[PDB]
């Protein structure tokens, strides 16, 4: 599962959060986007591709993902795109559960930050930089780095 990310939009406190999960490590990337549109979604996905190795994206078929602009960008960047209906187990199996967890952590940080954006960043940080609570457990960020390094 080198380069494989699964992505979905979720909604929290009236805002749209585009969430990307590196499926092999569980590392999370997340950004608030202005609108659930082709243009905002292309913009955010390009930011992810600029920062991380992405070989394939697994999404649902929302019109912000399934459209000529995204199709063209992903072709141009050499990224495979897998999609089906919202919630499908083929390309969206991890998102309900991950978005559930992320929101719990966002809520946790809300009262101690000055913005939703900072609450999100703190929740993401916690999830990426906490070791799995098991004997050999690694943080998702570590698993990411280690997997890429070997690759």
How would you characterize the overall build of this protein?
The chain is of the alpha/beta class. The chain has a single domain (1-151), classed as Nucleotidyltransferase, domain 5 (2-Layer Sandwich), CATH 3.30.420. The protein is 42% helix and 22% strand. The protein has five helices and five strands; from the N terminus they run βββαβαβααα. The protein has helices spanning 38-51, 68-77, 95-109, 116-129, 140-150, and strands at residues 4-12, 15-22, 28-33, 56-60, 80-84. It has a five-stranded mixed sheet with strand order 3-2-1-4-5, sandwiched between helices. Strand 1 (4-12) and strand 2 form a beta hairpin. Helix 1 (38-51) runs parallel beside helix 2 (68-77) and helix 3 (95-109) crosses helix 4 (116-129). The longest helix has 15 residues, at 95-109. The protein is globular, with a radius of gyration of 15 Å. 26% of the residues are buried. Residues 3-148 form the Integrase catalytic domain. This is Integrase. It comes from Feline immunodeficiency virus (isolate Petaluma) (FIV).
């Amino acid at each position: 599962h080198m380069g494989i990310w699964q992505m979905d939009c979720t909604h929290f406190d009236g805002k749209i959060i585009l969430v990307g999960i590196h499926v092999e490590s569980g590392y999370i990337w997340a950004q608030i986007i202005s609108q659930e549109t082709a243009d905002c979604t292309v913009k955010a996905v390009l930011q992810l591709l600029s920062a991380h190795n992405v070989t394939e994206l697994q999404t649902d078929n929302g019109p912000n993902f399934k459209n000529q602009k995204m199709e063209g960008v992903l072709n141009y960047m050499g990224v495979k795109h897998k999609f089906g209906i919202p919630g499908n187990p083929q390309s969206q199996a991890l998102v309900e559960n991950v978005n559930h967890t992320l929101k719990v952590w966002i809520q946790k940080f809300l009262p101690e930050t000055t913005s939703l954006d900072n609450a999100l960043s703190l929740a993401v940080h916690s999830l990426n930089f906490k070791r799995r609570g098991r004997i050999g457990g690694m943080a998702p960020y570590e698993l990411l780095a280690q997997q890429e390094s070997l690759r």
